[PDB]
Amino acid sequence: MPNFFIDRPIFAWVIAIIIMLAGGLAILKLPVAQYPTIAPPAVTISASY
Amino acid sequence: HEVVKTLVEAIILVFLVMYLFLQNFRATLIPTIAVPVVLLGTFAVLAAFGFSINTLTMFGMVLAIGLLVNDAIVVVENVERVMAEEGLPPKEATRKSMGQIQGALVGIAMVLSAVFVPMAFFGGSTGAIYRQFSITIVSAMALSVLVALILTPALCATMLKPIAKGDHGEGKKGFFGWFNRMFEKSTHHYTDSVGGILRSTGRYLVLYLIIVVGMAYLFVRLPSSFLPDEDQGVFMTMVQ
Amino acid sequence: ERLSGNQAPSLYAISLIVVFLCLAALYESWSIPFSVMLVVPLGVIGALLAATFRGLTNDVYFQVGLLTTIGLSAKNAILIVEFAKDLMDKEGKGLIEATLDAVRMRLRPILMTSLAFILGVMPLVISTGAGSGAQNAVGTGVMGGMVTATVLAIFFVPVFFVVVRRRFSRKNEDIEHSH
Ligand SMILES: CCCCCCCCCCCCO[C@@H]1O[C@H](CO)[C@@H](O[C@H]2O[C@H](CO)[C@@H](O)[C@H](O)[C@H]2O)[C@H](O)[C@H]1O
Numbered sequence: 001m002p003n004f005f006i007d008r009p010i011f012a013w014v015i016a017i018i019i020m021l022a023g024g025l026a027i028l029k030l031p032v033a034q035y036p037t038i039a040p041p042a043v044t045i046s047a048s049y
Numbered sequence: 050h051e052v053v054k055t056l057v058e059a060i061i062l063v064f065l066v067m068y069l070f071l072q073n074f075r076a077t078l079i080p081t082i083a084v085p086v087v088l089l090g091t092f093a094v095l096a097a098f099g100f101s102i103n104t105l106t107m108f109g110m111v112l113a114i115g116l117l118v119n120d121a122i123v124v125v126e127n128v129e130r131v132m133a134e135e136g137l138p139p140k141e142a143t144r145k146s147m148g149q150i151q152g153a154l155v156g157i158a159m160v161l162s163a164v165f166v167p168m169a170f171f172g173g174s175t176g177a178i179y180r181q182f183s184i185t186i187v188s189a190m191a192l193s194v195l196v197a198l199i200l201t202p203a204l205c206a207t208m209l210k211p212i213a214k215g216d217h218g219e220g221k222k223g224f225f226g227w228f229n230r231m232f233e234k235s236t237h238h239y240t241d242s243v244g245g246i247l248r249s250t251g252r253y254l255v256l257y258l259i260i261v262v263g264m265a266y267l268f269v270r271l272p273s274s275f276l277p278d279e280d281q282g283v284f285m286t287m288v289q
Numbered sequence: 290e291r292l293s294g295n296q297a298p299s300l301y302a303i304s305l306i307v308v309f310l311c312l313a314a315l316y317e318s319w320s321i322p323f324s325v326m327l328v329v330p331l332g333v334i335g336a337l338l339a340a341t342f343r344g345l346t347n348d349v350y351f352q353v354g355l356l357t358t359i360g361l362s363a364k365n366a367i368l369i370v371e372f373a374k375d376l377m378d379k380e381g382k383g384l385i386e387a388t389l390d391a392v393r394m395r396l397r398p399i400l401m402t403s404l405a406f407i408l409g410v411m412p413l414v415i416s417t418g419a420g421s422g423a424q425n426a427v428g429t430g431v432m433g434g435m436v437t438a439t440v441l442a443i444f445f446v447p448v449f450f451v452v453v454r455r456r457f458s459r460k461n462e463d464i465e466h467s468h
């Protein structure tokens with residue numbers, strides 16, 4: 001494989017470019033937060049008398 | 050069901066056009082077989098992806114056929130041309146016909162899927178429409194490459210009747226011998242035509258530019274919509 | 290709608306960019322992929338001509354059908370160019386000689402493909418009956434696109450290839466070398 005791309009520098013560049021632009025697009029659409037969901041979820045029952 | 054019907058007709062029209070060039074029932078069967086295998090495989094993939102049979106997936110099946118049939122003919126015909134040139138028997142003729150183009154097949158399907166994959170990522174409510182279609186086509190292209198690596202080569206090695214060295218079938222009988230003797234039509238007349246448009250070349254480039262312009266013209270002036278209204282054999286009337 | 294916006298331009302831009310990158314890998318070249326991509330208008334002109342002079346609209350069925358024509362015409366263009374290049378590499382053959390030699394051998398398989406498909410999709414353009422609207426819409430664009438693509442590209446692809454190789458030199462070629 002290394003011998004393959006040593007002779008095919010361009011093919012190597014396209015693989016790297018496609019990976020990058022794939023990631024670039026990913027960044028435009030990714031949610032941002034401090035944390036993902038890390039809290040266990042809770043359910044509260046409320047009642048009044 | 051109406052789309053299923055045109056799908057079956059498309060296959061039969063392909064089978065007739067295959068039979069016109071390759072003039073062996075044995076040989077035109079090869080590409081024709083590939084279609085049902087790839088398409089039925091695609092339905093299975095559709096199930097894998099949790100898709101449904103709908104107008105867009107069905108139109109995928111139909112439009113895929115040109116792509117699939119191309120995969121089959123590429124392999125079959127490249128064998129045809131290895132035999133009439135080196136008088137080799139079917140089993141060897143396809144063995145290095147495949148050894149010399151199996152990379153191309155994989156490669157090309159890869160660049161072609163670039164045409165459809167980004168469209169899978171169309172977003173919104175109207176997004177699933179474009180995505181169903183892209184996955185169908187790309188799935189079919191994948192299977193078609195699989196089929197072109199597995200079944201088609203096998204079918205070429207066991208179904209293709211031998212061709213002698215130099216044979217071009219220019220004297221069969223009646224029409225078929227006519228079309229072949231006349232397939233060099235302008236395989237010669239055309240390539241002398243191409244050789245002519247190369248000497249100049251200067252203003253064949255200018256023609257292209259008007260085409261790009263007329264294209265730009267026609268395109269901006271053509272209105273856009275989503276999905277057409279259909280006659281569903283029913284309608285309603287409001288009274289207020 | 291106020292969610293909608295415009296996906297079209299960018300997605301097809303991404304598409305054109307990834308296609309160019311793929312072609313570059315295929316031929317190991319930044320320039321030669323242009324000879325294959327310049328074929329895109331040739332099929333779009335048919336799709337426009339077809340839909341235009343049949344009162345059709347630019348809708349979902351127009352867009353998907355065009356993708357198909359572009360794919361199938363890209364594929365025919367690639368096969369010509371693959372063989373024109375492999376004859377300048379595994380063989381010594383000069384440009385013009387290896388262009389025609391590749392065109393000859395690929396003329397048959399091209400017309401086989403295009404006609405068999407153009408004709409196979411005609412039951413769609415000729416369709417009457419239920420869902421005929423979508424069958425007519427998707428059908429006519431592909432047929433017009435394929436016809437224009439398939440007659441034009443047959444002459445333009447050889448022109449694309451030689452013109453491109455003679456702007457991105459090497460300054461050695463055009464006489465057939467020795468392996
Ligand atoms: C070129 C060959 C490959 C391409 C062919 C693709 C055409 C397939 C599209 C058919 C559309 C699907 O239509 C589907 O038909 C089958 C068969 O009647 C129905 O199936 C029904 O009958 C069959 C057999 O009688 C029962 O086994 C099944 O339990 C029942 O649900 C499905 O409920 C229906 O949804």
Ligand SMILES: CCCCCCCCCCCCO[C@@H]1O[C@H](CO)[C@@H](O[C@H]2O[C@H](CO)[C@@H](O)[C@H](O)[C@H]2O)[C@H](O)[C@H]1O
Pocket residue numbers: 164175273274275293294295296297301304305308329347352355356359
């Ligand atoms: C490199 C291979 C691929 C190259 C392909 C290049 C040609 C592709 C041309 C496809 C046609 C694009 O045409 C474009 O379609 C989009 C659909 O999102 C239309 O979008 C329009 O209609 C939709 C209908 O629901 C509305 O929601 C949207 O708000 C509106 O802008 C644009 O008005 C049109 O300009």
